[PDB]
Design a protein around this ligand. Structure first.
Ligand SMILES: NC(=O)C1=CN([C@@H]2O[C@H](COP(=O)(O)OP(=O)(O)OC[C@H]3O[C@@H](n4cnc5c(N)ncnc54)[C@H](OP(=O)(O)O)[C@@H]3O)[C@@H](O)[C@H]2O)C=CC1
Ligand SMILES: NC(=O)C1=CN([C@@H]2O[C@H](COP(=O)(O)OP(=O)(O)OC[C@H]3O[C@@H](n4cnc5c(N)ncnc54)[C@H](OP(=O)(O)O)[C@@H]3O)[C@@H](O)[C@H]2O)C=CC1
Ligand SMILES: CC1(C)N=C(N)N=C(N)N1OCC(=O)Nc1ccc(Cl)cc1
Ligand SMILES: CC1(C)N=C(N)N=C(N)N1OCC(=O)Nc1ccc(Cl)cc1
Lengths: 522, 528
């Protein structure tokens, strides 16, 4: 077939167009009033250059022998495509430029800028040329025809995670025809998140042996099948940051230790992982299922206030600590003399009054115990190279008084070149229900500390101690692993807020959260 | 020449031989004794030996057929060549060597004196002819000391696959001293335990759908002007190695990442460091004790410090009486005064590790006070949780008592230990807030690895993984030259730690209950 012999790849960038279900079709905005929908997106413009111009001559011979039996790249445009290009660069910095047109003759441009009559008249032009691969730069109509006639092999698709006004749309790529094989890292250019994905059409080596020898000792470990992680195992490059979470699910399903827990439900457990997310490039809110952030933002505002009063949350219908405050739960904790929803000296108490004697959840504790939250802020502002900027919730003295010991042991902060990174160490991590919320919680927190100290958020680093998947979560997570992440959304904080205690629920916006549908983890 | 065409490799296994000791690669030279191997079974070596000497790649032969047939002007099995003593050492049940073309060098013996499917040769010359007239993938020289000596001398070996057996045995025959101009190490394996010895595997080398490979180059359009440009020529040895699988490279490779990508910051004193934030190292304590080999470390001091912790001591005088100076500088009049501890006795370090481990929440008075049944005895508690509720996810030991920070001589570097129990095996995560890669971390790895052993033993479990999480990971700028020397040293196989096994209680350990066996190490380095 033609499209494997000649190497015809499309290359596009699609934004979003003016509740809401998402799928790949979400991204389709191509152009508007003859120009791109967006002002300038220089990373995608840079990606464009690299992909179209790149050449590898050492693999061209293998192309030259197959192509005949039947150096630079070919780039195909349409008139309104060729036209919209600002003058001062045509032809495009050393590429074989080419235009599919009806009312243009090859006379009135160069002899390098080969015009074509119809789609069928391109195969003619290639068998007579010396080129690496063939990139359809496109236009609505150009893409429509080249796809309709199964001419395109791979598709270099840039997903622009922001909404614009559009007069022209990429066609609905048929998912039984084509399928995503690679997803890139997520990036911020020009005040939007984006990523780079790849649709394919469906069907010394001294040191290579030395590799095999070194593997001479390697070991259905857990009852988890091959055919079920199909989409997951059928991707080549999985560089989207959400794969950091998803790959831990995989490792614990594949290699996890079978264990009883207190409940009896059954878990697969491993011990010791890192996740790093770049807060300067995205907000890591998992896209492979719907997540809600009001509750966990109220939880955070509750901590910052120093509250241990489970009821302040329940009245706002944030039920994160409902189970941990019942008579039945406090009694099983031997807390027989503790009022319902009095969670004892937990996070907020420890952050604001570590070392103070806890009484009940209504006492006045002003200027009692160590106000760690205040202390790490001053340190961040006044001593940013300090290696002592920890917020610790694990107060050994008070553990038995807490409804439960803190799942999140401590935050450590780091400062370089007006940028703030944070490590949260989590002693116990429910990967299915908990961890996705936990990533979002401390990322927001990392932003909040960043803002009130006049620093840019850099890295949120999540250290997992006991990392467990509930046996009764495995079906749901199987469905989830075989979803492909979307580009992440962004967090906008109200910039007026300049002290850690002044954030209200209103001051938090999530933008461009493009997500798969909800999953009952149960 | 002749070695590249016919792919003639050597494979051996060498132990240390009977002899303030200095160590080079000639440390590992002992090949056999009284006609046989110096050791009973080392199964992991024997299995490696089989994987390498029987592995062929069908698809790769075609190009080797071509290459070899070109030079001569013209199931798949490897050839294995052995001296007659070597051949006679093999038991009948394993002769001839399975799934391989056996060749034997000998003058005293001819075909007539062998029942077995074997080629006999009296000349090295005859082998090269034999190889010319045969279909094989790779030719491995199994040795005998004499066979090894002459195939080297004749510049015939492309690579030596070399097992360092990190134990000592009576030996009568030795591997030849390898000329370091002739052969350079290009690979070093993981370290392992088999039949009560550590070993690794190192490869000496001689000197003098391709559509989705393009997709990689694309997904790198946005990479590096690499921060601190320190010079290549400096890390020549470190970067030459193709496979760096020795667990010590976990430490070494962080030094490199900090040197090449570290952030420049001036610190608490007005000195100068390179820093990054957030690393993890994993060390399999069932397989080796990860005491670093690229420089000398003594453990007496850090074992005294750990016994001093477990006792709940805060008294610097106890360590100085044992000539352990680890805490001396944090105990001086000058230092306690600069921490505003004007009302604190010299060497009274206040409510630090020991105090927090046995008495967390008790009011610190002075280092002489009897704090019995005051504060939470964390150490006793976690020893009980590991014994009675092993799946508990709350087996943390914590030194970071927020309330007492200002009363300590300095806050703890080593913040907490979380423990994990599966199938009678104990693992330990240790979170370090501030890590001097240069002096501190080598010791910090040694301390918590010994601690995992101690807890594991007194709870009737086996040590599994010690996991080291680094927060602010930094290199002092005056350590840089010293660390360059160090990154160009090739690790040796790790030693082993023996705990006196009669100790059933965490408090009952004493210095003499601790034995490091087979520490093979490079030379002492002053980071200063
Ligand atoms: N999102 C993206 O990745 C990209 C978007 N763009 C945007 O695309 C928009 C323009 O695209 P759309 O309107 O289709 O314009 P096109 O670029 O597809 O141009 C259409 C013209 O190409 C010629 N043509 C198409 N098919 C044939 C054929 N089968 N036989 C002969 N000639 C043919 C005709 O030229 P004639 O005029 O001679 O009839 C036709 O009018 C602009 O807004 C531009 O900014 C451009 C590139 C990439
Ligand atoms: N640790 C390890 O990795 C290894 C250890 N070993 C050990 O080493 C010892 C055996 O080795 P070592 O005694 O050197 O003896 P070798 O195995 O090298 O035997 C040498 C004999 O083989 C013959 N031979 C060697 N070279 C030639 C030649 N060029 N032309 C004709 N014949 C030749 C001669 O046999 P003849 O006497 O018949 O003339 C010679 O006496 C044993 O203890 C064995 O277990 C062996 C291999 C590996
Ligand atoms: C520009 C765009 C949308 N981005 C990607 N990744 N891939 C494409 N095919 N698109 O470009 C085609 C095109 O017309 N490019 C182009 C080249 C130079 C200028 Cl100045 C403007 C548009
Ligand atoms: C087996 C041994 C000692 N290990 C390595 N790495 N390399 C070798 N050359 N050695 O073996 C050579 C030999 O004589 N092998 C042999 C094979 C089977 C038995 Cl049963 C005994 C010895």
């Amino acid at each position: 077939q033609v499209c494997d012999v000649f190497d015809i790849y499309a290359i596009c960038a699609c934004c979003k167009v003016e509740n809401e279900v998402f799928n790949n079709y979400t991204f389709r905005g191509l152009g508007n009033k003859g120009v791109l929908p967006w002002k300038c997106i220089s990373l995608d413009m840079k990606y464009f250059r690299a992909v179209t111009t790149y050449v590898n001559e050492s693999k061209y011979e293998k192309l030259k022998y197959k192509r005949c039996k039947y150096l630079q790249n070919v780039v195909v445009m349409g008139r309104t495509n060729w036209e919209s290009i600002p003058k001062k660069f045509k032809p495009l910095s050393n590429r074989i430029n080419v235009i599919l047109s009806r009312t243009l003759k090859k006379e009135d441009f160069d002899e390098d800028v080969y015009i074509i009559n119809k789609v069928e008249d391109l195969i003619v032009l290639l068998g007579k040329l010396n080129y690496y691969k063939c990139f359809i730069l496109g236009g609505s109509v150009v893409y429509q025809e080249f796809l309709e006639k199964k001419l395109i092999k791979k598709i270099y698709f840039t997903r622009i995670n922001s909404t614009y006004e559009c007069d022209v749309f990429f066609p609905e790529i048929n998912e039984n025809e084509y399928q995503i094989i690679s997803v890139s890292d997520v990036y911020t250019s020009n005040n939007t998140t984006l990523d780079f994905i790849i649709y394919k059409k469906t069907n010394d080596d001294e040191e290579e042996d030395d590799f095999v020898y070194f593997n001479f000792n390697k070991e259905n470990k857990n009852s988890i099948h091959p055919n079920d992680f199909q989409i997951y195992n059928s991707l080549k490059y999985k560089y989207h940051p959400e794969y950091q979470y998803l790959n831990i699910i995989y490792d614990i399903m594949m290699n996890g230790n079978k264990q009883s827990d207190r409940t009896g439900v059954g878990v697969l457990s491993k011990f010791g992982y890192i996740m790093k997310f770049d807060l300067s490039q995205y907000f890591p809110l998992l896209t492979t299922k719907k997540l809600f952030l009001r509750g966990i933002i109220e939880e955070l505002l509750w901590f910052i206030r120093g509250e241990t009063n489970g009821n302040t949350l329940l009245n706002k219908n944030v039920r994160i600590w409902e189970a941990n405050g019942t008579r039945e739960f406090l009694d099983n904790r031997k807390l027989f003399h503790r009022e319902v929803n009095d969670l004892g000296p937990i996070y907020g108490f420890q952050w604001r009054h570590f070392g103070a004697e806890y009484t009940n959840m209504y006492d006045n504790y002003e200027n009692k115990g160590v106000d760690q939250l205040k202390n790490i802020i001053n340190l961040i502002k006044n001593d940013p190279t300090s290696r002592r900027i920890l917020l610790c919730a694990w107060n050994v003295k008070d553990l038995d008084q807490m409804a439960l010991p803190p799942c999140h042991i401590l935050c450590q902060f780091y400062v370089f070149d007006g940028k703030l990174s944070c490590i949260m160490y989590q002693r116990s991590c429910d990967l299915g229900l908990g961890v996705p919320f936990n990533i979002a919680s401390y990322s927001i927190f990392t932003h909040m500390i960043a803002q009130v100290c006049n620093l840019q958020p850099a890295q949120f680093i999540h250290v997992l101690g006991n990392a467990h998947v509930y046996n009764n979560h495995i079906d749901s997570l199987k469905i989830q692993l075989n979803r492909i992440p979307y580009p992440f959304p962004t967090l906008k904080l109200n910039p007026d807020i300049k002290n850690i205690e002044d954030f209200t629920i209103s001051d938090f916006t999530i933008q461009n959260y493009v997500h798969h549908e909800k999953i009952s983890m149960d």
